[PDB]
Amino acid sequence: EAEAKAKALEAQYRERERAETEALLARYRERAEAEAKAVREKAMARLDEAVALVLKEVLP
Amino acid sequence: SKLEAILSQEVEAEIQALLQEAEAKAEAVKREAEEKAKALLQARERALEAQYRAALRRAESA
């Protein structure tokens, strides 16, 4: 009984480890892509509105 | 035969004491190994559960 329950615990919860790790990690890749494209969208429209300010400051 | 029939009944009392020790040994071994069965159950469960939990913590943190 000790060996049977030990092997059952080890195998089943090892595959539980792998499944839960993968299931959480995939949505972490999802958040990575989401954050990257969201800051791209925030970046791509607000260009050239401040480069006239930095050219006002650089040129004497 | 009276007095060595009493000696042979002392012998049956030795049989009685031996079966007392037999039942006592069976119950003692079963009890101590039951304690160890439950203790090793909980030991390997909580150990691999803590390893699983710490792997989940460090995985989501990374």
Side-chain angles (χ1 to χ4, degrees):
Chain A
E1 288 182 354
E3 193 271 331
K5 292 181 70 68
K7 186 177 180 180
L9 193 285
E10 286 176 353
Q12 185 64 39
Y13 290 87
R14 177 63 181 83
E15 187 64 29
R16 185 182 302 276
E17 181 269 333
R18 176 61 64 197
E20 290 293 325
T21 302
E22 182 65 31
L24 195 63
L25 179 144
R27 189 184 57 83
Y28 289 157
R29 276 99 172 95
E30 177 66 30
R31 193 266 178 195
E33 183 70 26
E35 177 67 29
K37 192 176 180 180
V39 72
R40 292 290 181 271
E41 194 273 336
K42 293 180 73 69
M44 65 177 288
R46 296 293 92 194
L47 190 144
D48 195 79
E49 55 94 26
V51 75
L53 188 273
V54 73
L55 264 301
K56 188 261 187 295
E57 187 170 358
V58 167
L59 295 176
Chain B
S1 181
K2 178 69 179 295
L3 189 54
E4 64 96 11
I6 297 300
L7 292 167
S8 182
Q9 199 277 125
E10 294 174 355
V11 163
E12 287 186 356
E14 292 178 353
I15 303 170
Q16 178 183 1
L18 198 279
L19 60 89
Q20 285 169 356
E21 292 176 354
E23 291 290 329
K25 191 262 182 181
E27 295 295 327
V29 172
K30 186 181 91 276
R31 179 67 180 270
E32 65 190 1
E34 179 179 0
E35 179 181 1
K36 292 287 103 176
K38 291 174 71 175
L40 268 66
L41 183 149
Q42 186 175 1
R44 65 104 177 85
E45 182 177 0
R46 297 294 296 275
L48 195 147
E49 191 272 333
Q51 184 179 2
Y52 168 72
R53 177 64 65 191
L56 293 176
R57 264 77 166 273
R58 191 263 179 194
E60 67 182 2
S61 299

Short mmCIF file of all heavy atoms in Angstrom, two decimals, chain B residues 1-61:
data_model
loop_
_atom_site.label_atom_id
_atom_site.label_comp_id
_atom_site.label_asym_id
_atom_site.label_seq_id
_atom_site.Cartn_x
_atom_site.Cartn_y
_atom_site.Cartn_z
N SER B 1 -4.67 -38.41 36.36
CA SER B 1 -3.52 -38.18 37.22
C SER B 1 -3.53 -36.72 37.70
O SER B 1 -3.39 -35.80 36.90
CB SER B 1 -2.23 -38.51 36.49
OG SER B 1 -1.10 -38.32 37.33
N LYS B 2 -3.64 -36.55 39.03
CA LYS B 2 -4.05 -35.27 39.61
C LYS B 2 -2.99 -34.18 39.44
O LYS B 2 -3.23 -33.17 38.77
CB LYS B 2 -4.35 -35.46 41.10
CG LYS B 2 -4.73 -34.21 41.84
CD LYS B 2 -6.08 -33.70 41.41
CE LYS B 2 -6.43 -32.46 42.20
NZ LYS B 2 -6.59 -32.77 43.65
N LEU B 3 -1.82 -34.37 40.04
CA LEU B 3 -0.90 -33.26 40.20
C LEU B 3 -0.14 -32.96 38.91
O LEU B 3 0.13 -31.80 38.61
CB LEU B 3 0.06 -33.54 41.35
CG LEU B 3 0.95 -32.38 41.80
CD1 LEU B 3 0.11 -31.16 42.12
CD2 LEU B 3 1.71 -32.79 43.04
N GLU B 4 0.16 -33.97 38.11
CA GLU B 4 0.71 -33.66 36.80
C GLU B 4 -0.36 -33.36 35.77
O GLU B 4 -0.04 -32.79 34.72
CB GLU B 4 1.65 -34.77 36.34
CG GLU B 4 1.02 -36.10 36.10
CD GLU B 4 0.69 -36.32 34.65
OE1 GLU B 4 1.14 -35.51 33.81
OE2 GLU B 4 0.04 -37.33 34.34
N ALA B 5 -1.64 -33.63 36.06
CA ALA B 5 -2.71 -33.00 35.30
C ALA B 5 -2.79 -31.51 35.60
O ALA B 5 -3.09 -30.70 34.71
CB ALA B 5 -4.05 -33.67 35.59
N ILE B 6 -2.51 -31.12 36.85
CA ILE B 6 -2.42 -29.71 37.19
C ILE B 6 -1.19 -29.08 36.54
O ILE B 6 -1.22 -27.93 36.09
CB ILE B 6 -2.44 -29.53 38.72
CG1 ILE B 6 -3.76 -30.03 39.30
CG2 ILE B 6 -2.23 -28.07 39.14
CD1 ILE B 6 -4.98 -29.32 38.76
N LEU B 7 -0.09 -29.84 36.46
CA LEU B 7 1.09 -29.37 35.73
C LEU B 7 0.80 -29.21 34.24
O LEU B 7 1.25 -28.24 33.61
CB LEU B 7 2.25 -30.33 35.97
CG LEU B 7 2.80 -30.34 37.40
CD1 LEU B 7 3.72 -31.52 37.60
CD2 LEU B 7 3.51 -29.04 37.71
N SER B 8 0.03 -30.12 33.66
CA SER B 8 -0.37 -29.96 32.26
C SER B 8 -1.43 -28.88 32.08
O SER B 8 -1.58 -28.34 30.98
CB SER B 8 -0.86 -31.29 31.70
OG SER B 8 -1.22 -31.15 30.34
N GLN B 9 -2.16 -28.52 33.14
CA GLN B 9 -3.06 -27.38 33.02
C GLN B 9 -2.29 -26.07 33.16
O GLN B 9 -2.67 -25.07 32.55
CB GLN B 9 -4.18 -27.48 34.06
CG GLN B 9 -5.41 -26.61 33.77
CD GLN B 9 -5.27 -25.17 34.22
OE1 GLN B 9 -5.44 -24.24 33.42
NE2 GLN B 9 -4.94 -24.97 35.49
N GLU B 10 -1.19 -26.08 33.92
CA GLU B 10 -0.22 -24.99 33.87
C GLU B 10 0.39 -24.87 32.48
O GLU B 10 0.69 -23.78 32.00
CB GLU B 10 0.89 -25.22 34.90
CG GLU B 10 0.44 -25.15 36.34
CD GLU B 10 1.56 -25.52 37.30
OE1 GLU B 10 2.64 -25.92 36.82
OE2 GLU B 10 1.36 -25.43 38.53
N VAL B 11 0.60 -26.02 31.82
CA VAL B 11 1.04 -26.03 30.43
C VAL B 11 -0.01 -25.40 29.51
O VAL B 11 0.31 -24.61 28.61
CB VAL B 11 1.39 -27.47 30.02
CG1 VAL B 11 1.46 -27.63 28.53
CG2 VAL B 11 2.71 -27.86 30.67
N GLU B 12 -1.30 -25.72 29.72
CA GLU B 12 -2.35 -25.03 28.96
C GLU B 12 -2.44 -23.55 29.31
O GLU B 12 -2.83 -22.75 28.46
CB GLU B 12 -3.72 -25.68 29.17
CG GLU B 12 -3.91 -27.01 28.49
CD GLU B 12 -5.34 -27.52 28.63
OE1 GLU B 12 -6.14 -26.87 29.32
OE2 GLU B 12 -5.65 -28.58 28.05
N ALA B 13 -2.07 -23.17 30.54
CA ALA B 13 -1.96 -21.75 30.87
C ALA B 13 -0.77 -21.11 30.16
O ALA B 13 -0.80 -19.92 29.86
CB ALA B 13 -1.83 -21.57 32.38
N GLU B 14 0.28 -21.89 29.88
CA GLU B 14 1.37 -21.38 29.06
C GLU B 14 0.93 -21.22 27.61
O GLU B 14 1.36 -20.27 26.94
CB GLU B 14 2.58 -22.31 29.15
CG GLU B 14 3.25 -22.31 30.52
CD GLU B 14 4.42 -23.27 30.60
OE1 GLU B 14 4.63 -24.03 29.63
OE2 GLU B 14 5.12 -23.27 31.62
N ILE B 15 0.09 -22.13 27.11
CA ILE B 15 -0.55 -21.96 25.81
C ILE B 15 -1.39 -20.69 25.79
O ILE B 15 -1.38 -19.92 24.82
CB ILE B 15 -1.42 -23.19 25.46
CG1 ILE B 15 -0.61 -24.47 25.47
CG2 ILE B 15 -2.04 -23.04 24.08
CD1 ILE B 15 -1.49 -25.70 25.37
N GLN B 16 -2.13 -20.46 26.88
CA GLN B 16 -2.95 -19.26 27.04
C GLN B 16 -2.09 -17.99 27.01
O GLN B 16 -2.42 -17.03 26.31
CB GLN B 16 -3.72 -19.34 28.36
CG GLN B 16 -4.56 -18.12 28.66
CD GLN B 16 -5.25 -18.21 30.00
OE1 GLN B 16 -5.09 -19.19 30.73
NE2 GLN B 16 -6.03 -17.19 30.33
N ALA B 17 -0.99 -17.99 27.77
CA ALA B 17 -0.09 -16.84 27.78
C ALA B 17 0.56 -16.63 26.42
O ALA B 17 0.76 -15.49 25.99
CB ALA B 17 0.98 -17.04 28.86
N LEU B 18 0.83 -17.72 25.70
CA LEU B 18 1.45 -17.60 24.39
C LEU B 18 0.47 -17.05 23.36
O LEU B 18 0.86 -16.26 22.49
CB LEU B 18 2.01 -18.96 23.97
CG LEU B 18 3.06 -19.11 22.85
CD1 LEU B 18 2.45 -19.07 21.47
CD2 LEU B 18 4.13 -18.04 22.98
N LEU B 19 -0.81 -17.43 23.44
CA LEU B 19 -1.78 -16.87 22.51
C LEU B 19 -2.14 -15.43 22.88
O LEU B 19 -2.46 -14.63 21.99
CB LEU B 19 -3.03 -17.76 22.43
CG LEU B 19 -3.94 -18.09 23.63
CD1 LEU B 19 -5.07 -17.07 23.82
CD2 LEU B 19 -4.48 -19.51 23.54
N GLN B 20 -2.07 -15.09 24.18
CA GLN B 20 -2.13 -13.69 24.61
C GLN B 20 -1.02 -12.87 23.98
O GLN B 20 -1.26 -11.80 23.42
CB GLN B 20 -2.04 -13.61 26.14
CG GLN B 20 -3.28 -14.02 26.90
CD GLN B 20 -3.01 -14.16 28.38
OE1 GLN B 20 -1.88 -14.02 28.83
NE2 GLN B 20 -4.05 -14.46 29.15
N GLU B 21 0.22 -13.38 24.04
CA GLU B 21 1.35 -12.69 23.43
C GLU B 21 1.25 -12.68 21.91
O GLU B 21 1.72 -11.73 21.28
CB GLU B 21 2.65 -13.35 23.88
CG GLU B 21 2.96 -13.15 25.35
CD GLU B 21 4.20 -13.89 25.78
OE1 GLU B 21 4.75 -14.64 24.96
OE2 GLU B 21 4.61 -13.73 26.95
N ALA B 22 0.61 -13.69 21.33
CA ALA B 22 0.41 -13.75 19.88
C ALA B 22 -0.53 -12.66 19.40
O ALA B 22 -0.20 -11.89 18.49
CB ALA B 22 -0.12 -15.13 19.51
N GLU B 23 -1.73 -12.59 20.01
CA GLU B 23 -2.68 -11.52 19.70
C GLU B 23 -2.10 -10.14 20.02
O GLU B 23 -2.29 -9.19 19.25
CB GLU B 23 -3.98 -11.74 20.48
CG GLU B 23 -4.79 -12.94 20.02
CD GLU B 23 -5.41 -12.73 18.66
OE1 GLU B 23 -5.73 -11.57 18.32
OE2 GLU B 23 -5.59 -13.72 17.92
N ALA B 24 -1.37 -10.03 21.13
CA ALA B 24 -0.76 -8.76 21.51
C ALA B 24 0.31 -8.33 20.51
O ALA B 24 0.40 -7.15 20.17
CB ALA B 24 -0.16 -8.87 22.92
N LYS B 25 1.08 -9.29 19.99
CA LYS B 25 2.11 -8.95 19.01
C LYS B 25 1.48 -8.55 17.68
O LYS B 25 1.95 -7.60 17.03
CB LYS B 25 3.06 -10.14 18.83
CG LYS B 25 4.33 -9.83 18.02
CD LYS B 25 4.22 -10.26 16.56
CE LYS B 25 5.51 -9.98 15.81
NZ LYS B 25 5.40 -10.37 14.38
N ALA B 26 0.41 -9.25 17.27
CA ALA B 26 -0.28 -8.89 16.02
C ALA B 26 -0.88 -7.50 16.10
O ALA B 26 -0.72 -6.69 15.17
CB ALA B 26 -1.36 -9.92 15.70
N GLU B 27 -1.51 -7.17 17.23
CA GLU B 27 -2.10 -5.85 17.38
C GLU B 27 -1.05 -4.76 17.54
O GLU B 27 -1.23 -3.66 17.02
CB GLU B 27 -3.06 -5.83 18.57
CG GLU B 27 -4.27 -6.72 18.38
CD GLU B 27 -5.17 -6.27 17.25
OE1 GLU B 27 -5.28 -5.04 17.02
OE2 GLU B 27 -5.77 -7.14 16.59
N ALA B 28 0.07 -5.07 18.20
CA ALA B 28 1.14 -4.09 18.37
C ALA B 28 1.79 -3.74 17.04
O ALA B 28 1.98 -2.56 16.72
CB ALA B 28 2.17 -4.61 19.37
N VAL B 29 2.12 -4.77 16.25
CA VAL B 29 2.74 -4.55 14.94
C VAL B 29 1.77 -3.84 13.99
O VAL B 29 2.17 -2.91 13.28
CB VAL B 29 3.25 -5.89 14.37
CG1 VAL B 29 3.72 -5.73 12.93
CG2 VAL B 29 4.39 -6.42 15.21
N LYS B 30 0.49 -4.23 14.02
CA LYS B 30 -0.50 -3.58 13.16
C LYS B 30 -0.70 -2.12 13.55
O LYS B 30 -0.81 -1.25 12.67
CB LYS B 30 -1.83 -4.32 13.23
CG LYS B 30 -2.87 -3.78 12.25
CD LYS B 30 -4.18 -4.52 12.37
CE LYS B 30 -5.09 -3.84 13.38
NZ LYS B 30 -4.82 -4.24 14.78
N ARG B 31 -0.69 -1.81 14.85
CA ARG B 31 -0.87 -0.44 15.30
C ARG B 31 0.32 0.44 14.93
O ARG B 31 0.15 1.56 14.42
CB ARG B 31 -1.11 -0.42 16.81
CG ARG B 31 -1.28 0.97 17.38
CD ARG B 31 -2.56 1.60 16.87
NE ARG B 31 -2.76 2.95 17.41
CZ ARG B 31 -3.41 3.20 18.54
NH1 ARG B 31 -3.92 2.21 19.25
NH2 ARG B 31 -3.54 4.45 18.96
N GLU B 32 1.55 -0.05 15.18
CA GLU B 32 2.72 0.78 14.90
C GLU B 32 2.94 0.94 13.40
O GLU B 32 3.30 2.03 12.93
CB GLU B 32 3.96 0.18 15.59
CG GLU B 32 4.41 -1.19 15.11
CD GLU B 32 5.47 -1.81 16.00
OE1 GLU B 32 5.83 -1.17 17.02
OE2 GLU B 32 5.91 -2.93 15.70
N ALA B 33 2.62 -0.08 12.61
CA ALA B 33 2.74 0.07 11.18
C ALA B 33 1.57 0.84 10.58
O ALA B 33 1.73 1.43 9.51
CB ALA B 33 2.86 -1.31 10.54
N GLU B 34 0.42 0.90 11.26
CA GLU B 34 -0.66 1.78 10.84
C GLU B 34 -0.30 3.24 11.05
O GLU B 34 -0.58 4.10 10.20
CB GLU B 34 -1.93 1.43 11.61
CG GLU B 34 -3.13 2.29 11.28
CD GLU B 34 -4.35 1.88 12.05
OE1 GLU B 34 -4.26 0.91 12.84
OE2 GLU B 34 -5.41 2.52 11.88
N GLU B 35 0.28 3.54 12.22
CA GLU B 35 0.86 4.85 12.49
C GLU B 35 1.87 5.24 11.41
O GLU B 35 1.83 6.35 10.88
CB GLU B 35 1.53 4.86 13.86
CG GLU B 35 2.19 6.18 14.21
CD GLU B 35 2.86 6.16 15.57
OE1 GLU B 35 2.83 5.10 16.23
OE2 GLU B 35 3.41 7.20 15.98
N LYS B 36 2.76 4.30 11.05
CA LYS B 36 3.74 4.60 10.01
C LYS B 36 3.11 4.72 8.63
O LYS B 36 3.60 5.51 7.81
CB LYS B 36 4.85 3.55 10.00
CG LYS B 36 5.76 3.56 11.24
CD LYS B 36 6.73 4.75 11.25
CE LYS B 36 6.30 5.87 12.20
NZ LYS B 36 7.31 6.96 12.25
N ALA B 37 2.04 3.98 8.35
CA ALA B 37 1.36 4.09 7.06
C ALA B 37 0.74 5.46 6.89
O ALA B 37 0.95 6.12 5.86
CB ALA B 37 0.30 2.99 6.92
N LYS B 38 0.04 5.94 7.92
CA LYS B 38 -0.55 7.28 7.86
C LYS B 38 0.52 8.37 7.85
O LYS B 38 0.39 9.37 7.13
CB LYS B 38 -1.51 7.48 9.03
CG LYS B 38 -2.76 6.62 8.94
CD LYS B 38 -3.60 6.76 10.20
CE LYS B 38 -4.24 8.13 10.27
NZ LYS B 38 -5.17 8.26 11.43
N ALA B 39 1.60 8.17 8.61
CA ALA B 39 2.66 9.17 8.68
C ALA B 39 3.42 9.28 7.37
O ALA B 39 3.71 10.39 6.91
CB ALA B 39 3.62 8.85 9.82
N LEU B 40 3.71 8.15 6.72
CA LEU B 40 4.40 8.18 5.43
C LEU B 40 3.50 8.66 4.31
O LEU B 40 4.00 9.34 3.39
CB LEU B 40 4.97 6.80 5.10
CG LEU B 40 6.41 6.51 5.53
CD1 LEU B 40 6.61 6.48 7.04
CD2 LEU B 40 6.88 5.21 4.91
N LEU B 41 2.20 8.33 4.36
CA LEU B 41 1.18 8.94 3.52
C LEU B 41 1.27 10.46 3.54
O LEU B 41 1.50 11.10 2.51
CB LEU B 41 -0.20 8.47 4.00
CG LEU B 41 -1.53 8.84 3.32
CD1 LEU B 41 -2.50 7.71 3.54
CD2 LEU B 41 -2.15 10.12 3.88
N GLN B 42 1.11 11.03 4.74
CA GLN B 42 1.11 12.48 4.87
C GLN B 42 2.47 13.08 4.56
O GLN B 42 2.54 14.17 3.98
CB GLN B 42 0.67 12.87 6.28
CG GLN B 42 0.49 14.36 6.50
CD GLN B 42 -0.06 14.67 7.87
OE1 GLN B 42 -0.29 13.77 8.68
NE2 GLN B 42 -0.28 15.95 8.14
N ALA B 43 3.55 12.36 4.85
CA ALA B 43 4.90 12.85 4.59
C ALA B 43 5.16 13.03 3.10
O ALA B 43 5.51 14.13 2.66
CB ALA B 43 5.93 11.89 5.20
N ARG B 44 4.96 11.97 2.31
CA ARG B 44 5.23 12.09 0.88
C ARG B 44 4.20 12.99 0.18
O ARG B 44 4.57 13.72 -0.75
CB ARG B 44 5.31 10.71 0.22
CG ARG B 44 4.05 9.87 0.20
CD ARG B 44 3.41 9.88 -1.17
NE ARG B 44 2.22 9.03 -1.25
CZ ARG B 44 1.00 9.42 -0.91
NH1 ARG B 44 0.79 10.63 -0.45
NH2 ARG B 44 -0.02 8.58 -1.02
N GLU B 45 2.96 13.02 0.68
CA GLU B 45 1.95 13.93 0.13
C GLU B 45 2.35 15.38 0.33
O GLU B 45 2.38 16.16 -0.63
CB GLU B 45 0.59 13.67 0.77
CG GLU B 45 -0.51 14.56 0.20
CD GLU B 45 -1.87 14.25 0.78
OE1 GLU B 45 -1.96 13.34 1.63
OE2 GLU B 45 -2.84 14.91 0.38
N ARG B 46 2.66 15.77 1.57
CA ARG B 46 2.96 17.17 1.85
C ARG B 46 4.30 17.58 1.27
O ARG B 46 4.46 18.74 0.87
CB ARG B 46 2.91 17.43 3.36
CG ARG B 46 1.53 17.20 3.98
CD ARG B 46 0.50 18.20 3.49
NE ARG B 46 0.83 19.57 3.89
CZ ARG B 46 0.51 20.10 5.06
NH1 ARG B 46 -0.15 19.39 5.96
NH2 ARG B 46 0.84 21.35 5.33
N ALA B 47 5.25 16.65 1.14
CA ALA B 47 6.53 16.98 0.54
C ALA B 47 6.39 17.27 -0.96
O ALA B 47 6.85 18.31 -1.45
CB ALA B 47 7.54 15.86 0.78
N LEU B 48 5.74 16.36 -1.70
CA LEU B 48 5.60 16.62 -3.13
C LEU B 48 4.59 17.73 -3.39
O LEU B 48 4.70 18.43 -4.40
CB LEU B 48 5.22 15.32 -3.86
CG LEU B 48 5.35 15.24 -5.39
CD1 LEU B 48 5.74 13.84 -5.82
CD2 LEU B 48 4.09 15.64 -6.12
N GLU B 49 3.64 17.94 -2.47
CA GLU B 49 2.72 19.07 -2.59
C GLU B 49 3.44 20.39 -2.40
O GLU B 49 3.15 21.36 -3.10
CB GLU B 49 1.59 18.91 -1.57
CG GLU B 49 0.41 19.86 -1.76
CD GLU B 49 0.61 21.18 -1.04
OE1 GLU B 49 1.33 21.20 -0.03
OE2 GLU B 49 0.05 22.20 -1.50
N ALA B 50 4.38 20.45 -1.45
CA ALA B 50 5.15 21.67 -1.25
C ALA B 50 6.08 21.94 -2.42
O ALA B 50 6.28 23.10 -2.81
CB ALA B 50 5.94 21.59 0.06
N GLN B 51 6.64 20.88 -3.01
CA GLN B 51 7.48 21.06 -4.20
C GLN B 51 6.66 21.54 -5.39
O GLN B 51 7.08 22.46 -6.11
CB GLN B 51 8.20 19.76 -4.55
CG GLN B 51 9.16 19.89 -5.71
CD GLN B 51 9.88 18.60 -6.02
OE1 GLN B 51 9.64 17.58 -5.39
NE2 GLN B 51 10.76 18.64 -7.01
N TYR B 52 5.48 20.95 -5.59
CA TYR B 52 4.52 21.41 -6.59
C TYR B 52 4.12 22.86 -6.38
O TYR B 52 4.09 23.66 -7.33
CB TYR B 52 3.31 20.48 -6.56
CG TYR B 52 2.09 20.95 -7.32
CD1 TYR B 52 2.06 20.96 -8.71
CD2 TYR B 52 0.94 21.34 -6.64
CE1 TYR B 52 0.93 21.38 -9.39
CE2 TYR B 52 -0.19 21.76 -7.31
CZ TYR B 52 -0.19 21.77 -8.69
OH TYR B 52 -1.31 22.19 -9.37
N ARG B 53 3.85 23.25 -5.13
CA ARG B 53 3.42 24.61 -4.82
C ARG B 53 4.54 25.62 -5.08
O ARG B 53 4.30 26.66 -5.71
CB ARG B 53 2.95 24.68 -3.37
CG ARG B 53 2.55 26.07 -2.92
CD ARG B 53 1.36 26.59 -3.70
NE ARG B 53 0.15 25.82 -3.44
CZ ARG B 53 -0.97 25.95 -4.15
NH1 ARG B 53 -1.02 26.82 -5.15
NH2 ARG B 53 -2.02 25.21 -3.85
N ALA B 54 5.76 25.31 -4.64
CA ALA B 54 6.89 26.21 -4.87
C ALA B 54 7.24 26.32 -6.35
O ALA B 54 7.65 27.40 -6.81
CB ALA B 54 8.11 25.75 -4.07
N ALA B 55 7.06 25.23 -7.11
CA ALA B 55 7.25 25.30 -8.55
C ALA B 55 6.22 26.21 -9.20
O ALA B 55 6.56 26.98 -10.11
CB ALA B 55 7.19 23.90 -9.16
N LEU B 56 4.97 26.17 -8.72
CA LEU B 56 3.94 27.06 -9.26
C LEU B 56 4.23 28.52 -8.94
O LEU B 56 4.07 29.40 -9.80
CB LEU B 56 2.56 26.67 -8.73
CG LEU B 56 1.96 25.33 -9.16
CD1 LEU B 56 0.64 25.14 -8.44
CD2 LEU B 56 1.78 25.26 -10.66
N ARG B 57 4.65 28.80 -7.69
CA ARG B 57 5.05 30.14 -7.28
C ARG B 57 6.18 30.70 -8.14
O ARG B 57 6.08 31.80 -8.69
CB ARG B 57 5.47 30.16 -5.81
CG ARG B 57 4.42 30.57 -4.80
CD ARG B 57 3.43 29.49 -4.51
NE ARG B 57 2.63 29.79 -3.33
CZ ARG B 57 3.01 29.47 -2.09
NH1 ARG B 57 4.17 28.86 -1.89
NH2 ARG B 57 2.24 29.77 -1.06
N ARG B 58 7.27 29.94 -8.27
CA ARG B 58 8.41 30.45 -9.02
C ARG B 58 8.11 30.51 -10.52
O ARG B 58 8.64 31.38 -11.21
CB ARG B 58 9.66 29.61 -8.72
CG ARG B 58 10.98 30.20 -9.25
CD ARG B 58 11.38 29.59 -10.60
NE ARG B 58 12.62 30.13 -11.14
CZ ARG B 58 13.02 29.95 -12.40
NH1 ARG B 58 12.27 29.25 -13.24
NH2 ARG B 58 14.15 30.48 -12.82
N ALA B 59 7.24 29.63 -11.02
CA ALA B 59 6.87 29.66 -12.43
C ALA B 59 6.08 30.92 -12.77
O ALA B 59 6.37 31.61 -13.75
CB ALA B 59 6.08 28.41 -12.80
N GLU B 60 5.07 31.24 -11.95
CA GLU B 60 4.30 32.45 -12.21
C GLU B 60 5.12 33.71 -11.95
O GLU B 60 4.95 34.72 -12.65
CB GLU B 60 2.99 32.46 -11.41
CG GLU B 60 3.12 32.57 -9.90
CD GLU B 60 1.78 32.51 -9.20
OE1 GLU B 60 0.76 32.34 -9.90
OE2 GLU B 60 1.75 32.64 -7.96
N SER B 61 6.06 33.64 -11.00
CA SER B 61 6.92 34.79 -10.74
C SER B 61 7.87 35.03 -11.90
O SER B 61 8.08 36.19 -12.30
CB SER B 61 7.68 34.56 -9.44
OG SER B 61 6.78 34.43 -8.35
#
